[PDB]
Design an enzyme around this catalytic site. Structure first.
Site, PDB file in Angstrom:
ATOM      1  N   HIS A   7      -0.994  -6.609   2.481  1.00  0.00           N
ATOM      2  CA  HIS A   7      -0.264  -7.172   1.327  1.00  0.00           C
ATOM      3  C   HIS A   7       1.190  -7.358   1.686  1.00  0.00           C
ATOM      4  CE1 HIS A   7      -0.121  -2.744   0.228  1.00  0.00           C
ATOM      5  NE2 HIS A   7       1.118  -2.994  -0.122  1.00  0.00           N
ATOM      6  N   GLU A  43       2.451  -1.692 -10.652  1.00  0.00           N
ATOM      7  CA  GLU A  43       2.058  -2.659  -9.609  1.00  0.00           C
ATOM      8  C   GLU A  43       1.046  -3.641 -10.180  1.00  0.00           C
ATOM      9  OE1 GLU A  43      -0.141   0.062  -6.879  1.00  0.00           O
ATOM     10  OE2 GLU A  43       1.736   0.390  -5.733  1.00  0.00           O
ATOM     11  N   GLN A  60       1.590  -7.807  -3.775  1.00  0.00           N
ATOM     12  CA  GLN A  60       1.729  -6.582  -4.571  1.00  0.00           C
ATOM     13  C   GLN A  60       3.091  -6.688  -5.260  1.00  0.00           C
ATOM     14  OE1 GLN A  60       2.517  -2.658  -2.699  1.00  0.00           O
ATOM     15  NE2 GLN A  60       0.400  -2.315  -3.385  1.00  0.00           N
ATOM     16  N   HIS A  84       8.521  -4.811   1.136  1.00  0.00           N
ATOM     17  CA  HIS A  84       7.814  -4.235   2.305  1.00  0.00           C
ATOM     18  C   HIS A  84       6.657  -5.110   2.701  1.00  0.00           C
ATOM     19  CE1 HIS A  84       5.417  -2.244  -1.083  1.00  0.00           C
ATOM     20  NE2 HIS A  84       4.379  -2.316  -0.274  1.00  0.00           N
ATOM     21  N   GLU A 134       4.234  -0.564   5.658  1.00  0.00           N
ATOM     22  CA  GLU A 134       3.178   0.297   5.102  1.00  0.00           C
ATOM     23  C   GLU A 134       1.920   0.166   5.941  1.00  0.00           C
ATOM     24  OE1 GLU A 134       2.306  -0.668   1.000  1.00  0.00           O
ATOM     25  OE2 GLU A 134       1.456   1.387   0.677  1.00  0.00           O
TER      26      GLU A 134
HETATM   27 CO   LIG Z   1       2.506  -1.495  -0.849  1.00  0.00          CO
END
Ligand SMILES: [Co+2]
Ligand SMILES: [Co+2]
Lengths: 141, 140
Positions: A7, A43, A60, A84, A134
């Protein structure tokens, strides 16, 4: 082994407004939404495609639920935008251990709960050329 | 319609050093590298996976070849990091025109050549909640 882009994490001030922007502009529906009280974020995952490793790629979209959250502080500093990127793996524990042994700062001692029952960890952006990174394993079946 | 995440655009000071970081740390490898003097970049595409629409998803690592580039100016202001996200479509022209008609500005009046003979355009980040958004039609 990291086998997909899982994502893109996109921080926003108003999740409902940003979700509606992605829906109205591109036709992307919400796949799943949840609150993570531990992280202090709400989220929404928007599924864009499936991937060759059996997984999926999402946007996301993240809004802070309180001022003392990492995402709330990031937004106050940087404004809305990409927060991210996430890579998917069948074995977050083994991949995180391999990357920590190479000298990369892993922000958590062990993976934590993520979106849709996933297990996740993060790598320090200053060891990743500015990119908060991540690592994600999807929920076990 | 937008049928995949095509790539993440990551700006860096030194493409070769950044590619080695992705290779050494994650075991990624370079799929394609090109110098684009129009855009003013040198860029490497690292293929991460294939996608259900028949395309692929990449990391696109970009270093400036001159400071008068969208990317060279952006690095001076922001430092290294994520510069844009790109979505794949079978028809960049049709989708850009539909999105302009919704009130989202398109940075080029006509699509331009991108990496690997793709056809690309960009949406204005101030109309996209701060995300510089590329639309990509891959070559045949
Ligand atoms: Co994430
Ligand atoms: Co691009």
């Amino acid at each position: 082994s990291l086998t997909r882009i899982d994502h893109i994490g996109i921080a926003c001030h108003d999740l409902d407004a940003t979700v509606e922007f992605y829906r109205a502009t591109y036709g992307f529906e919400v796949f799943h939404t949840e609150v993570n009280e531990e992280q202090g974020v709400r989220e929404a995952m928007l599924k864009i495609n499936d991937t060759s490793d059996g997984g999926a790629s999402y946007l996301q979209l993240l809004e802070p639920t309180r001022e003392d959250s990492a995402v709330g502080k990031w937004l106050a500093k940087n404004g809305e935008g990409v927060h991210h990127i996430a890579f998917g793996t069948a074995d977050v524990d083994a991949d995180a251990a391999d990357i920590r042994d190479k000298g990369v700062r892993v922000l958590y001692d062990e993976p934590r709960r993520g979106s849709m029952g996933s297990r996740i960890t993060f790598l320090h952006p200053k060891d990743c050329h500015g990119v908060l990174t991540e690592l994600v394993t999807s929920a076990a079946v």
